[PDB]
Amino acid sequence: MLGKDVSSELQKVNIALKDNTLSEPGTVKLDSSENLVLNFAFSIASVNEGDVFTVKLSDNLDTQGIGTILKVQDIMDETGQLLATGSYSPLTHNITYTWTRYASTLNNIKARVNMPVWPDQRIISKTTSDKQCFTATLNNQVASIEERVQYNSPSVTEHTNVKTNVRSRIMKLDDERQTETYITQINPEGKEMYFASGLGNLYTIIGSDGSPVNLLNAEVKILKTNSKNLTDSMDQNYDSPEFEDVTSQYSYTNDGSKITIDWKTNSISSTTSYVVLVKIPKQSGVLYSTVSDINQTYGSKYSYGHTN
Ligand SMILES: [Ca+2]
Ligand SMILES: [Ca+2]
Ligand SMILES: [Ca+2]
Ligand SMILES: [Ca+2]
């Protein structure tokens, strides 16, 4: 930036991070659709078209949650006209606002914004026992708040004849493509999984309760890794050396309502975990995943929902 960033000329600047909407202030429950709230305000005597100002967030804070939209809401004046448009950058964790031609015609502009912000699931990708520090800066004013970040734990069954564990999550909603990504972790706990003789192979069934979800066009990818490489948000680099693509090894059936994967064994070792990624058009409905027999009579089941 050589010039034109007007953040240093803003007056009466205020900025704050708040957690009033959390069910239990002190902890953000990312699997209970919780988030923090950012607000800021200022005045500015005049601006030029194309000038910018920047709201800086800490590296562990984003404007997205599970979304993919970079735009943030426009800033409007009292007449309902547009003062500035803005966008979030994954690179810098900054929100950059650009003043409009309309704004450049005014004098004594007031700006005020409220928006949700989330602990970034790619950065704080696992449940934390201790509080994390979240900050935002606008010129010389800074806000901070501390919160633990919590994700749900896996479903586990540990009996003599059946040992299973599983977890799933809708971890991405793509705005442009109108899709959702539903990820299933098989053996996220890194334990022995087992069905005793007479109980058949271990299977993973992916379906919906309500089956309102259409899976006919699902894109399915299956990866193998050690559990120590798995995050709780499931938003991680799946192209890394720690993951092997085994999609071709484990064929599946799909009747449009259920996807059934035969693991081809009654035993999965503690050091073997699988991740099944299912991408489908965005749809309302609660999806579930299992590690079970084909009839979902025994084993484990985890559910995760979404509403348009
Ligand atoms: Ca929510
Ligand atoms: Ca930064
Ligand atoms: Ca820490
Ligand atoms: Ca773990």
Paired residues of 41 in beta bridges: 14, 112
Distance from residue 177's CA to the centre of ligand 4 (Å): 31
Q: Which domains, from first to last, does the chain contain?
A: 1-151 (2.60.40.1280), 152-308 (2.60.40.1290)
Question: How many angstroms does the Cα of residue 261 sit away from the middle of ligand 3?
Answer: 38
Ligand 4 mean position, distance from CA 181 (Å) = 21
Token digits of residue 251: 């064929």
Technique used by the depositors? X-ray
- Which H, E and C letters describe the chain, residue by residue? CCCCECHHHCEEEEEEEECCCCCCCCEEECCCCCCEEEEEEEEECCCCCCCEEEEEECCCEECCCCECCCEEEEEECCCCCEEEEEEECCCCCEEEEEECHHHHCCCCEEEEEEEEEEECCCCCCCCCCCCEEEEEEECCEEEEEEEEEECCCCEEEECCCEEEEEEEEEEEEECCCCEEEEEEEECCCCCCEEECCCCCCCEEEEEECCCCCCCCCCEEEEEEECHHHCCCCCCCCCCCCCCEECCCCCCEEECCCCEEEECCCCEECCCCEEEEEEEEECCCEEEEEEEECCCCCCEEEEEEEECC
Structure's resolution in angstroms: 1.6
Q: Has 92 been labeled as part of a binding site?
A: yes
Distance from the CA of 86 to the center of ligand 2, in angstroms?
A: 16
Q: Which ligand is nearest to the CA of 165?
A: 4
59 appears as a binding residue in the annotation: yes
Residue 33 counted as an annotated binding residue: yes
